[PDB]
RNA sequence: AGAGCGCAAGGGUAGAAGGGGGCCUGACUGCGAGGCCUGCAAGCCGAGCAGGGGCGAAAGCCGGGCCUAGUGAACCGGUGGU
RNA sequence: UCCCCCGUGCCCAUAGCGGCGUGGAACCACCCGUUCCCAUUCCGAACACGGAAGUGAAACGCGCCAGCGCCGAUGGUACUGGGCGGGCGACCGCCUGGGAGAGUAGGUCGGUGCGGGGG
C-alpha cells in the first residue's frame, strides 16, 4: 500500500511500506 | 631462546657446511679444526677484543650456540642428563668464520683475534678479504 | 564444483554431459578412458524452436535415434553445475522415453 | 685484466689442481666450452679486479672474449677455489655488480663511532660499453643512527639499478667499548 | 551405558549403546529381526 | 513495484550526469546502486532471545523483507560468548526493495536524527562501498513511540559497481545523499 | 624419568610394486592419510588400504597436483 | 590451505574427509573371494552373493565416525530365547 | 587438408600471478522478467524458469609483455656402493664406480587428443 507521509513541513512523501499514516516530525525539507 | 629442552650428541661430520667467507667487517676470524665451542668460550673472546679496544671498532659474532651440552650429577645411569653445566653450544667446523672485526686497522684487528684464539680451543686463522665474494 | 562431475566419471562409461546455455542445450555421449565423444546432439547447434525445455524434450529422443543406431544402453548421466530440475530433466525426458 | 685462457675437455678434475691449473667454465646464451685457468696467473688477476672489472680471456684461437666471473666456488677449508665462471658478454644490456667508494667521514666516526659499509658493491643492470669502475656515495651527513639507502646514489648516465631502492647501501653504527662491561655482564 | 535393543510383538536382539543422560530418554530404531522381515524395537 | 520517486532519479538524473563526470564508453560502467545489506550486531539481547524477536520484527518494518540471523564463530568468553548464539540481524536486499526503503531514508531518517549536520564522507574505504551506523533507529517512517522498548541501534551496508570512491562520492550523492563534506 | 614408551609399529607403506601379479582382491598399499588412491580397479577400506577389485598387473602413475594414485591393468 | 576435521601426535584432506539443510538409521542379518600382519594366539583390509531395506531422478551409495589409542585368552557364573 | 568458436579429456606451473590489448557475424557470457517449474536461514547474488531489446564492461576466448612465481644446464663439489693407505684421537687422504642441493647460463606467459558449430 502507497504510505503517505504527513510531516509538519508540508513535504508530503508517497512510498512503499505498512500504514499510510506516517506522521513524520520536521523531515527533510526542514 | 625457545627451542625445546636437550638434544643428541651427533658427530662433527667432516668440514661440508661448516665454512663461510668473511661476510662482515675488514678482518675475519676462523676454525681450522672440527668442535663444540662454549657460550662462555665466545664470550672469553667477545670481552677480550673489546678490552684490547676501549672506544673501538664494532664486533660481529657469526656462529651461535643452539645446542644443549648435557651433563650429569656426578652419580650413574638413571635418565639422561639434566646437563646444561656448560649451557649451549655451537657445532663449528673447518673453515668456518667466527669472529668478524671492523674501524680498527690491521695492528688492531690482528692483536684483537689472535688473542681470541688463545680463549679458544682449536686452531685459528685470521684473515683479511682478497676479493673472493659471490 | 565439478564435484559431480567427478564421481561420475568412476562409475562406469558412456557418460551425458548436459550443458545448457541461455536459450541453448547441448548434450554428449562421452565414452571416458580417451577422450572421444560419439554421439553429441546439440539444440541451437541444431534447428530447433526456442522454448527451452520444449526443445530440451526433443534434445532427448534425438539421441535416442542416435544411441541404438551406434549401440548403446548406459544411462550414466552427468549432473554438472545444473541441479536436476528442468530444462536438464527434460534432458532426461526423451532420453529415456525409450 | 688479460689473462691467458686454456681449453679443458676429458682431463680429471683434480689432476689439473696437480698443475697449479684451476679448472673453470666460460658460456652465454650463444656458448657453452671447459676451460681452465693458470691459478697464479687467476689469483693476481682476480684480487685486483674480482668481480667488477672485466677480465677478456684469450684462447689458443686468438680469441678475446669479454667475460665477468658470475660465481667462484671456493674450498672450505684454507680459503682456495676449486671452479670459476665466466659470463661472456656482447653488447646489450646486463647485470652485474659495480665497486663502491666512500668519500669524507661521516658525522658518525669524526665524532666517535665505526663506519659499517654493508655492501662494497651495488647491483646494476648496465651494458658492456658502461663498466662504471666506483660508484661514488657522499656519505658526510650521516649522523650516528642514520644510514644512506639503494635511493640516493650518483648513478652515471644509462645505469639504472636492479635491486630495490629501498635496500640500504650501508649504515653507521655505535662503537662498542669497555664501559659497555660493566652493564653487559652485570644485569 | 550398555544397551541391547529387543522387538516388538516378539523378544529378538542386537548390539548397542545407550548414553543415558544425553538426549537419549526414549529408542525406538528399525531393525532386522530374522522370524519374518522388518519391525521396530526399543530399550532397557 | 518497479516505479517510485527515487529510482528515476537514478535513471533520469543521475545516470547522465555520472557520465559527465567520467565519461564512459559503455552503458554498464556507470556506477551502479544494487545491494544493500543491513546488519543489527546485538551481543546485548544475547542471552534471552525474546528481545531478540521484538527487534528483528520491528527490524522488518524498516526494511520491508523478511529478515535472518547470522550466528557467531570463534568464542567471545570475556563478553560471555561461544557457539553459535550470538545474533547479528541481517537483511539483504536488492531490486526495488532497497529502493523503497532508500526512499524513506534520505528524505525521512536522516533529516529527523538528532542534530545532522551530514554523513560522515571518510566511510568510503576505497573501493566503491561505504558504510554508517546510527543509535536510535526509531528515526524511521513506520516506527512509532509507544513500541520502542530500547533504543538499540544498527549499522548499514552498500555496494556499487564503483571501483574507486570517488565514483561513489558522486553517485550517492546525485541519489539525494547528505554529507557533511 | 617418564620416556619409555613408543607405539607398537604398524609396519605400513607400499606391499605391491608395478609391475605385478595381483590375485582377485588382494592388498597393495597401506597407508596413513592419502599418499596414494584408487585407479583402474583399485579400491579401497576405511584404513585407506588400496587393493584390487579384480586380478592383473600393479601400476603406479603420478598426476603431479592431483596426487598419485595406484592402478592395476588386467588380462582376461 | 598456515583452518577445520570431539580429545596426543602423525600422515592426510577444501578436486572434502571440512560447514549448513532435507529425508533417514546398512551403529543390517547370513557368508566371505583374496590379502595385510604374524612364532602362537591375536589384530587388520575387503571385492562380491542371497534376503530385506535406506537416502537418490538415475548412476549409485550405506556391514557406524578421515584413519592410526579408547583395552582382556580361557576358566567360573548372571538374564533371554530357540 | 586449413582457421574461429563450443564441450570435454590428457601432462600437472615451461600451464600460473600481474600488465596492455582485441572479439560480438556465429557461439558464450551478461541481461528482460519472476506467470509457471523451481529457489534463498534474507534476498532471482547462487540455484531455477519463460525470452526479445541492449552490450563486450565484467566473466571469458586470443594474442604481446618477464616484474613475481615456476622451470633450470654444463662444470665442480659435497656425499658415496666398493677397494686401500696415514694418525693418539677429534679425524684425514688416494683408487674405482655413482654423484646431489645450492647457484650460474638460460627457459615460459604453454602442449595435444576426440566430438560439434562456423567461412
Given at each position: 500500500?502507497?504510505?503517505?507521509?504527513?510531516?509538519?513541513?508540508?513535504?508530503?512523501?508517497?512510498?512503499?511500506?505498512?500504514?499510510?499514516?506516517?506522521?513524520?516530525?520536521?523531515?527533510?525539507?526542514? | 631462546?625457545?627451542?625445546?629442552?636437550?638434544?643428541?650428541?651427533?658427530?662433527?661430520?667432516?668440514?661440508?657446511?661448516?665454512?663461510?667467507?668473511?661476510?662482515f667487517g675488514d678482518?675475519?676470524?676462523?676454525?681450522?679444526?672440527?668442535?663444540?665451542?662454549?657460550?662462555?668460550?665466545?664470550?672469553?673472546?667477545?670481552?677480550?677484543?673489546?678490552?684490547?679496544?676501549?672506544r673501538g671498532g664494532k664486533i660481529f659474532?657469526?656462529?651461535?650456540?643452539?645446542?644443549?651440552?648435557?651433563?650429569?650429577?656426578?652419580?650413574?645411569?638413571?635418565?639422561?642428563?639434566?646437563?646444561?653445566?656448560?649451557?649451549?653450544?655451537?657445532?663449528?667446523?673447518?673453515?668456518?668464520?667466527?669472529?668478524?672485526?671492523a674501524g680498527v686497522?690491521?695492528?688492531?684487528?690482528?692483536?684483537?683475534?689472535?688473542?681470541?684464539?688463545?680463549?679458544?680451543?682449536?686452531?685459528?686463522?685470521?684473515?683479511?678479504?682478497?676479493?673472493?665474494?659471490? | 564444483?565439478?564435484?559431480?562431475?567427478?564421481?561420475?566419471?568412476?562409475?562406469?562409461?558412456?557418460?551425458?554431459?548436459?550443458?545448457?546455455?541461455?536459450?541453448?542445450?547441448?548434450?554428449?555421449?562421452?565414452?571416458?578412458?580417451?577422450?572421444?565423444?560419439?554421439?553429441?546432439?546439440?539444440?541451437?547447434?541444431?534447428?530447433?524452436?526456442?522454448?527451452?525445455?520444449?526443445?530440451?524434450?526433443?534434445?532427448?529422443?534425438?539421441?535416442?535415434?542416435?544411441?541404438?543406431?551406434?549401440?548403446?544402453?548406459?544411462?550414466?548421466?552427468?549432473?554438472?553445475?545444473?541441479?536436476?530440475?528442468?530444462?536438464?530433466?527434460?534432458?532426461?525426458?526423451?532420453?529415456?522415453?525409450? | 685484466?688479460?689473462?691467458?685462457?686454456?681449453?679443458?675437455?676429458?682431463?680429471?678434475?683434480?689432476?689439473?689442481?696437480?698443475?697449479?691449473?684451476?679448472?673453470?667454465?666460460?658460456?652465454?646464451?650463444?656458448?657453452?666450452?671447459?676451460?681452465?685457468?693458470?691459478?697464479?696467473?687467476?689469483?693476481?688477476?682476480?684480487?685486483?679486479?674480482?668481480?667488477?672489472?672485466?677480465?677478456?680471456?684469450?684462447?689458443?684461437?686468438?680469441?678475446?672474449?669479454?667475460?665477468?666471473?658470475?660465481?667462484?666456488?671456493?674450498?672450505?677449508?684454507?680459503?682456495?677455489?676449486?671452479?670459476?665462471?665466466?659470463?661472456?658478454?656482447?653488447?646489450?644490456?646486463?647485470?652485474?655488480?659495480?665497486?663502491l667508494?666512500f668519500v669524507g667521514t661521516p658525522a658518525g666516526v669524526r665524532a666517535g663511532g665505526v663506519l659499517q659499509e654493508i655492501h662494497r658493491?651495488?647491483?646494476?643492470?648496465?651494458?658492456?660499453?658502461?663498466?662504471?669502475?666506483?660508484?661514488?656515495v657522499d656519505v658526510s651527513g650521516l649522523e650516528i643512527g642514520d644510514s644512506l639507502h639503494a635511493?640516493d646514489?650518483?648513478?652515471?648516465?644509462?645505469?639504472?639499478?636492479?635491486?630495490?631502492?629501498?635496500?640500504t647501501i650501508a649504515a653507521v653504527v655505535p662503537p662498542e667499548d669497555?664501559?659497555?662491561?660493566?652493564?653487559?655482564?652485570?644485569? | 551405558?550398555?544397551?541391547?535393543?529387543?522387538?516388538?510383538?516378539?523378544?529378538?536382539?542386537?548390539?548397542?549403546?545407550?548414553?543415558?543422560?544425553?538426549?537419549?530418554?526414549?529408542?525406538?530404531?528399525?531393525?532386522?529381526?530374522?522370524?519374518?522381515?522388518?519391525?521396530?524395537?526399543?530399550?532397557? | 513495484?518497479?516505479?517510485?520517486?527515487?529510482?528515476?532519479?537514478?535513471?533520469?538524473?543521475?545516470?547522465?550526469?555520472?557520465?559527465?563526470?567520467?565519461?564512459?564508453?559503455?552503458?554498464?560502467?556507470?556506477?551502479?546502486?544494487?545491494?544493500?545489506?543491513?546488519?543489527?550486531?546485538?551481543?546485548?539481547?544475547?542471552?534471552?532471545?525474546?528481545?531478540?524477536?521484538?527487534?528483528?520484527?520491528?527490524?522488518?518494518?524498516?526494511?520491508?523483507?523478511?529478515?535472518?540471523?547470522?550466528?557467531?564463530?570463534?568464542?567471545?568468553?570475556?563478553?560471555?560468548?561461544?557457539?553459535?548464539?550470538?545474533?547479528?540481524?541481517?537483511?539483504?536486499?536488492?531490486?526495488?526493495?532497497?529502493?523503497?526503503?532508500?526512499?524513506?531514508?534520505?528524505?525521512?531518517?536522516?533529516?529527523?536524527?538528532?542534530?545532522?549536520?551530514?554523513?560522515?564522507?571518510?566511510?568510503?574505504?576505497?573501493?566503491?562501498?561505504?558504510?554508517?551506523?546510527?543509535?536510535?533507529?526509531?528515526?524511521?517512517?513506520?516506527?512509532?513511540?509507544?513500541?520502542?522498548?530500547?533504543?538499540?541501534?544498527?549499522?548499514?551496508?552498500?555496494?556499487?559497481?564503483?571501483?574507486?570512491?570517488?565514483?561513489?562520492?558522486?553517485?550517492?550523492?546525485?541519489?539525494?545523499?547528505?554529507?557533511?563534506? | 624419568?617418564?620416556?619409555?614408551?613408543?607405539?607398537?609399529?604398524?609396519?605400513?607403506?607400499?606391499?605391491?610394486?608395478?609391475?605385478?601379479?595381483?590375485?582377485?582382491?588382494?592388498?597393495?598399499?597401506?597407508?596413513?592419510?592419502?599418499?596414494?588412491?584408487?585407479?583402474?580397479?583399485?579400491?579401497?577400506?576405511?584404513?585407506?588400504?588400496?587393493?584390487?577389485?579384480?586380478?592383473?598387473?600393479?601400476?603406479?602413475?603420478?598426476?603431479?597436483?592431483?596426487?598419485?594414485?595406484?592402478?592395476?591393468?588386467?588380462?582376461?
Amino acid at each position: 500500500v502507497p504510505a503517505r507521509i504527513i510531516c509538519g513541513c508540508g513535504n508530503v512523501i508517497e512510498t512503499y511500506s505498512t500504514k499510510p499514516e506516517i506522521y513524520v516530525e520536521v523531515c527533510s525539507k526542514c | 631462546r625457545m627451542k625445546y629442552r636437550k638434544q643428541q650428541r651427533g658427530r662433527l661430520k667432516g668440514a661440508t657446511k661448516g665454512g663461510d667467507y668473511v661476510a662482515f667487517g675488514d678482518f675475519g676470524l676462523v676454525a681450522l679444526e672440527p668442535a663444540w665451542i662454549t657460550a662462555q668460550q665466545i664470550e672469553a673472546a667477545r670481552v677480550a677484543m673489546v678490552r684490547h679496544f676501549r672506544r673501538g671498532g664494532k664486533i660481529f659474532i657469526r656462529i651461535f650456540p643452539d645446542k644443549p651440552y648435557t651433563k650429569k650429577p656426578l652419580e650413574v645411569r638413571m635418565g639422561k642428563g639434566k646437563g646444561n653445566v656448560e649451557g649451549y653450544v655451537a657445532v663449528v667446523k673447518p673453515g668456518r668464520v667466527m669472529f668478524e672485526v671492523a674501524g680498527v686497522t690491521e695492528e688492531q684487528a690482528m692483536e684483537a683475534l689472535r688473542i681470541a684464539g688463545h680463549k679458544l680451543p682449536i686452531k685459528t686463522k685470521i684473515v683479511r678479504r682478497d676479493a673472493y665474494d659471490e | 564444483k565439478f564435484r559431480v562431475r567427478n564421481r561420475i566419471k568412476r562409475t562406469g562409461r558412456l557418460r551425458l554431459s548436459v550443458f545448457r546455455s541461455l536459450k541453448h542445450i547441448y548434450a554428449q555421449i562421452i565414452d571416458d578412458e580417451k577422450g572421444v565423444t560419439l554421439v553429441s546432439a546439440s539444440s541451437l547447434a541444431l534447428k530447433l524452436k526456442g522454448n527451452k525445455t520444449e526443445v530440451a524434450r526433443q534434445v532427448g529422443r534425438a539421441l535416442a535415434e542416435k544411441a541404438l543406431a551406434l549401440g548403446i544402453k548406459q544411462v550414466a548421466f552427468d549432473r554438472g553445475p545444473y541441479k536436476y530440475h528442468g530444462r536438464v530433466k527434460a534432458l532426461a525426458e526423451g532420453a529415456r522415453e525409450g | 685484466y688479460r689473462l691467458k685462457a686454456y681449453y679443458r675437455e676429458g682431463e680429471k678434475p683434480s689432476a689439473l689442481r696437480r698443475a697449479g691449473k684451476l679448472p673453470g667454465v666460460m658460456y652465454n646464451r650463444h656458448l657453452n666450452r671447459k676451460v681452465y685457468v693458470d691459478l697464479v696467473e687467476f689469483d693476481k688477476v682476480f684480487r685486483q679486479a674480482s668481480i667488477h672489472h672485466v677480465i677478456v680471456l684469450e684462447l689458443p684461437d686468438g680469441q678475446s672474449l669479454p667475460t665477468l666471473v658470475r660465481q667462484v666456488n671456493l674450498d672450505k677449508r684454507r680459503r682456495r677455489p676449486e671452479h670459476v665462471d665466466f659470463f661472456v658478454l656482447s653488447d646489450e644490456p646486463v647485470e652485474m655488480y659495480v665497486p663502491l667508494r666512500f668519500v669524507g667521514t661521516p658525522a658518525g666516526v669524526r665524532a666517535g663511532g665505526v663506519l659499517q659499509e654493508i655492501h662494497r658493491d651495488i647491483l646494476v643492470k648496465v651494458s658492456p660499453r658502461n663498466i662504471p669502475e666506483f660508484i661514488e656515495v657522499d656519505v658526510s651527513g650521516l649522523e650516528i643512527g642514520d644510514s644512506l639507502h639503494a635511493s640516493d646514489l650518483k648513478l652515471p648516465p644509462g645505469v639504472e639499478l636492479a635491486v630495490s631502492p629501498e635496500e640500504t647501501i650501508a649504515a653507521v653504527v655505535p662503537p662498542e667499548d669497555v664501559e659497555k662491561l660493566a652493564e653487559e655482564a652485570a644485569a | 551405558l550398555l544397551l541391547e535393543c529387543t522387538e516388538c510383538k516378539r523378544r529378538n536382539y542386537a548390539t548397542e549403546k545407550n548414553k543415558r543422560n544425553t538426549p537419549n530418554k526414549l529408542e525406538l530404531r528399525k531393525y532386522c529381526p530374522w522370524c519374518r522381515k522388518h519391525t521396530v524395537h526399543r530399550e532397557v | 513495484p518497479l516505479d517510485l520517486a527515487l529510482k528515476r532519479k537514478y535513471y533520469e538524473e543521475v545516470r547522465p550526469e555520472l557520465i559527465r563526470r567520467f565519461g564512459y564508453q559503455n552503458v554498464w560502467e556507470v556506477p551502479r546502486l544494487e545491494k544493500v545489506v543491513i546488519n543489527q550486531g546485538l551481543g546485548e539481547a544475547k542471552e534471552d532471545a525474546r528481545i531478540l524477536e521484538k527487534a528483528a520484527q520491528e527490524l522488518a518494518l524498516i526494511t520491508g523483507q523478511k529478515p535472518a540471523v547470522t550466528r557467531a564463530k570463534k568464542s567471545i568468553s570475556n563478553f560471555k560468548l561461544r557457539k553459535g548464539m550470538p545474533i547479528g540481524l541481517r537483511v539483504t536486499l536488492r531490486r526495488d526493495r532497497m529502493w523503497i526503503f532508500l526512499e524513506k531514508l534520505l528524505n525521512v531518517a536522516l533529516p529527523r536524527i538528532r542534530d545532522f549536520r551530514g554523513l560522515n564522507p571518510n566511510s568510503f574505504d576505497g573501493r566503491g562501498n561505504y558504510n554508517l551506523g546510527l543509535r536510535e533507529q526509531l528515526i524511521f517512517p513506520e516506527i512509532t513511540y509507544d513500541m520502542v522498548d530500547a533504543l538499540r541501534g544498527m549499522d548499514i551496508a552498500v555496494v556499487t559497481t564503483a571501483e574507486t570512491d570517488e565514483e561513489a562520492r558522486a553517485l550517492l550523492e546525485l541519489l539525494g545523499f547528505p554529507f557533511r563534506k | 624419568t617418564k620416556n619409555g614408551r613408543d607405539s607398537q609399529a604398524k609396519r605400513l607403506g607400499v606391499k605391491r610394486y608395478e609391475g605385478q601379479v595381483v590375485r582377485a582382491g588382494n592388498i597393495l598399499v597401506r597407508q596413513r592419510g592419502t599418499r596414494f588412491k584408487p585407479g583402474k580397479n583399485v579400491g579401497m577400506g576405511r584404513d585407506f588400504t588400496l587393493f584390487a577389485l579384480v586380478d592383473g598387473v600393479v601400476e603406479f602413475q603420478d598426476r603431479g597436483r592431483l596426487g598419485r594414485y595406484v592402478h592395476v591393468r588386467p588380462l582376461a
